[PDB]
Amino acid sequence: MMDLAYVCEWEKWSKSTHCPSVPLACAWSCRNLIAFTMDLRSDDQDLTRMIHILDTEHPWDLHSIPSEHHEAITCLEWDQSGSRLLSADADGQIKCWSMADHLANSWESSVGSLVEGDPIVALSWLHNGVKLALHVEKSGASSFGEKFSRVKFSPSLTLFGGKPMEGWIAVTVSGLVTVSLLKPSGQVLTSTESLCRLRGRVALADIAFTGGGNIVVATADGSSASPVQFYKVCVSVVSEKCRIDTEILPSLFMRCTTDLNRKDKFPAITHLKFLARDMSEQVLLCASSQTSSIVECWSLRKETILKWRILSATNDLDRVSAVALPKLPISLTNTDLKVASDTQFYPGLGLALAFHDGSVHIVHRLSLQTMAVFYSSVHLKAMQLSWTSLALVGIDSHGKLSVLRLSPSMGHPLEVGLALRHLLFLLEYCMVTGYDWWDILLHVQPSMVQSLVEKLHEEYTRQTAALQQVLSTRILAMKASLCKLSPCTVTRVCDYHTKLFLIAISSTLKSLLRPHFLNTPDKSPGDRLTEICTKITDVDIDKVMINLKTEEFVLDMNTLQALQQLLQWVGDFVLYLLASLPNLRPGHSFLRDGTSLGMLRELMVVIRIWGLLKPSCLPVYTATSDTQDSMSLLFRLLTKLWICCRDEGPASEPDEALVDECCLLPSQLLIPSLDWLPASDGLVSRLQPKQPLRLQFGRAPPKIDHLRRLHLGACPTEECKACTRCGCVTMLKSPNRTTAVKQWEQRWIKNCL
Amino acid sequence: QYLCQPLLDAVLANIRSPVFNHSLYRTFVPAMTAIHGPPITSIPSVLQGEVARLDPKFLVNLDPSHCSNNGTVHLICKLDDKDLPSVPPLELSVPADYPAQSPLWIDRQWQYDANPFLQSVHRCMTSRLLQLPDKHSVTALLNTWAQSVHQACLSAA
Numbered sequence A: 001m002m003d004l005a006y007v008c009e010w011e012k013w014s015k016s017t018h019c020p021s022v023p024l025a026c027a028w029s030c031r032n033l034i035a036f037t038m039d040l041r042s043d044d045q046d047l048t049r050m051i052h053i054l055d056t057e058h059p060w061d062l063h064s065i066p067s068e069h070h071e072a073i074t075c076l077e078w079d080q081s082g083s084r085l086l087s088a089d090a091d092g093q094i095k096c097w098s099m100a101d102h103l104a105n106s107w108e109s110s111v112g113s114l115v116e117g118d119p120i121v122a123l124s125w126l127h128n129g130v131k132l133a134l135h136v137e138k139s140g141a142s143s144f145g146e147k148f149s150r151v152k153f154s155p156s157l158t159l160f161g162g163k164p165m166e167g168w169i170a171v172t173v174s175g176l177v178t179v180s181l182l183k184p185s186g187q188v189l190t191s192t193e194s195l196c197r198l199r200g201r202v203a204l205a206d207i208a209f210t211g212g213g214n215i216v217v218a219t220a221d222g223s224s225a226s227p228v229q230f231y232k233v234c235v236s237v238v239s240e241k242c243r244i245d246t247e248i249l250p251s252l253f254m255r256c257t258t259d260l261n262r263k264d265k266f267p268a269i270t271h272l273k274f275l276a277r278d279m280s281e282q283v284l285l286c287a288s289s290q291t292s293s294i295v296e297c298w299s300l301r302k303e304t305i306l307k308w309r310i311l312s313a314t315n316d317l318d319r320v321s322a323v324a325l326p327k328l329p330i331s332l333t334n335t336d337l338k339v340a341s342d343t344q345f346y347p348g349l350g351l352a353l354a355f356h357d358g359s360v361h362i363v364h365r366l367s368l369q370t371m372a373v374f375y376s377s378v379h380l381k382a383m384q385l386s387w388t389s390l391a392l393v394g395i396d397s398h399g400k401l402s403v404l405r406l407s408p409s410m411g412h413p414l415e416v417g418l419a420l421r422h423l424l425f426l427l428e429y430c431m432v433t434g435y436d437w438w439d440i441l442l443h444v445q446p447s448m449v450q451s452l453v454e455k456l457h458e459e460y461t462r463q464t465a466a467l468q469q470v471l472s473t474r475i476l477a478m479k480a481s482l483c484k485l486s487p488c489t490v491t492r493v494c495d496y497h498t499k500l501f502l503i504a505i506s507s508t509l510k511s512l513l514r515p516h517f518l519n520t521p522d523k524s525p526g527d528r529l530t531e532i533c534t535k536i537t538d539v540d541i542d543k544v545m546i547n548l549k550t551e552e553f554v555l556d557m558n559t560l561q562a563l564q565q566l567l568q569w570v571g572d573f574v575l576y577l578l579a580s581l582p583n584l585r586p587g588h589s590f591l592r593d594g595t596s597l598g599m600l601r602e603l604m605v606v607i608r609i610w611g612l613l614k615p616s617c618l619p620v621y622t623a624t625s626d627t628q629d630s631m632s633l634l635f636r637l638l639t640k641l642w643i644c645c646r647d648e649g650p651a652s653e654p655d656e657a658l659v660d661e662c663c664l665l666p667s668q669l670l671i672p673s674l675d676w677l678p679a680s681d682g683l684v685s686r687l688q689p690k691q692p693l694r695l696q697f698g699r700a701p702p703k704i705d706h707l708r709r710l711h712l713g714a715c716p717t718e719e720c721k722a723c724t725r726c727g728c729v730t731m732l733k734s735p736n737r738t739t740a741v742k743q744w745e746q747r748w749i750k751n752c753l
Numbered sequence B: 001q002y003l004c005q006p007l008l009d010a011v012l013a014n015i016r017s018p019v020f021n022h023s024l025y026r027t028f029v030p031a032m033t034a035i036h037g038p039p040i041t042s043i044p045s046v047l048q049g050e051v052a053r054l055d056p057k058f059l060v061n062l063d064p065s066h067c068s069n070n071g072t073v074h075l076i077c078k079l080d081d082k083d084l085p086s087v088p089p090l091e092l093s094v095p096a097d098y099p100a101q102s103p104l105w106i107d108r109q110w111q112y113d114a115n116p117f118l119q120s121v122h123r124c125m126t127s128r129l130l131q132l133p134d135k136h137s138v139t140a141l142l143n144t145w146a147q148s149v150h151q152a153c154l155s156a157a
């Protein structure tokens, strides 16, 4: 079923006029990063050459890049990863845009290439050779190895091991090609050579890999009287430069002209491309006249040894102004095709299409007929999908950011169980990788949340205990994000989101300590510290502190004052949590999930060592007894909660004897503060299907750092990097650098969890 | 002024510090919020003001010739008086930023010919206008142009 998300529109920016308009192209990262452009002609030329980057949660704070160019950008593509860019244009002027310092609004490009007097007709990157297969037939496989296994395409030109080289190639508009490859070192090797003896006009072309590091290219002069030649790239770096051998493939002529009825119809070629990148045995070839367009698919199946053959065509077409390809990698098996055909599952079979009128249509990839129909009530210049293709953005000849949310359901009747199963497969598609999956959280219903979180609870299981070492954080954040959309759990997502910060701060400070002389060898002091904590459930702690290998824990006596605030904070959120007993509560899930409380038991036993060793670093709380060492009697309360929680799956409500003792807490201790992470600054709690919000730019319809516990003023000054995934202020320049922890900052030096 | 130098010396010692807003917070916050109480629950407007109190005996309007919508402006004057006879209409010249500058007036010697009365009018213009002070308004020049007609009519009559 089709949904329209929003349109985010600048004020006094649209209605480009008094200029020859240009078709536009769009690009998208591996992450949720749309890179787009628009032709304006408003007293400057760089508005046409302008780069706009929109993070997927806040469509207003757009990253702006004034890409200066002598000729307007024609093709825009990203890297396979989210690290490199290309803005293709005539006569070279191509750069390499790398990410700047893990912000959200910062780029740079100090390197690139240029060719003089020769526009470029085709371009592509190099290959990596890493690819897996998606099996929707294996929904009940209950293992990530079965549903996700590598197909192992051959990596391109693996030198010095199995690592394929990095670079890109391009075919110019004349009889000339260029290659530029980045070394393992900082240098780059660029070569340029005539593709054959025939140097000529090339209207259209495409570039696609083959198995073995070779590349097959296409040609299109546009004179409508020439054969469509095909050439092969032979990579060979002969000791100083990549000498490339060229040869002619068995070519093809064109149909719809030998029938002799009408041959000068559709007089110029307008589209020539391969079906998908990295493969050159299936060619889209479309000729558009001033009225309509005609499209043909050619297949390189062996009977000449390399002969192209027609596949399919639809009923009627208008003038196509925009086209794209599906991005989800179905295992290309016919059993997968049938199990994706009987159930409503089409995430990777739809080639995007557009016309000169207000209509949005898909076309099926294998069979060129019009699969979907929608009516817009403009000619679309480009579209830009996602890997799951659950959402996309479109560029017409206006400044409107039409964002459409698709789905494989289509409105053919899917039951509730098939609604679970269609989303669970694409959830496992993103949970196996370190990717971004914002577009698949869109179509979730509030009733769908309770059904899907219960499935995701068992999705953490059924893996062989090693994947689950580090993806626990990702699944906690996953059901943090998905529970936000349900009104019953929007008051409960604070439990998940604060627990992400708790597990972020937990493991990183358990690595700073080290035994100067090793005790209990062939294992860390941390596991012995765990077992002495789980074997002693004592009310007090002065009996405990004798046999805790007190001579092993020795610090450098310098960073204890610096790390005060964190150890100020971790015992204070406990101090709040002791007073939440006599109350769906935003702190209710911690009463039954004692793993956080188990970590709280584990952390404080080494903190008390420094508290009795150097008491200047102790966290000063707000009890109404300043001479009372109340930490022993709080060990009493946490052990009283633990005997109600250390049972394996207890589901035990703590007794009222603990409740009245926790009512003695306000006699001394009062709640300092909290920090609920899930501030819904994203569009998760702002939009609705059939209820779009026409957004604008920059309208935006007690300030303490979420990561570090340093209190700021009412309107602080220090800058931050935009953690777009949850809106926590990942502040940029830490106050202490010469004496700083080198992992607690570096774990989220890039992004948040 | 007297015994306040600890407070003055603390802020200069704690300046250029990134923990400044948190060091002051840590040393100060519980003291005031505990005992004293909890927290709470075309043409410029210069000529538009100029022509507002101009005399109705002048009917000055813009020149039909020359450039428009630019810094320099020219205003041709109309005099409808039954007391005074007919004279050439006269035309001024005022550049951009009319306050704090001294404008000018056009010159045409042959228009005031064929009568020595008009020559006396021109000589009276050269007499009165050459002693006008700097940076004066258009009312002074308009009124000195107006009074010289009577000053020449009394000599003519």
Ligand SMILES: [Zn+2]
Pocket (backbone or CB within 6 Å): A723, A725, A726, A727, A728, A751, A752, A753
């Ligand atoms: Zn975050």
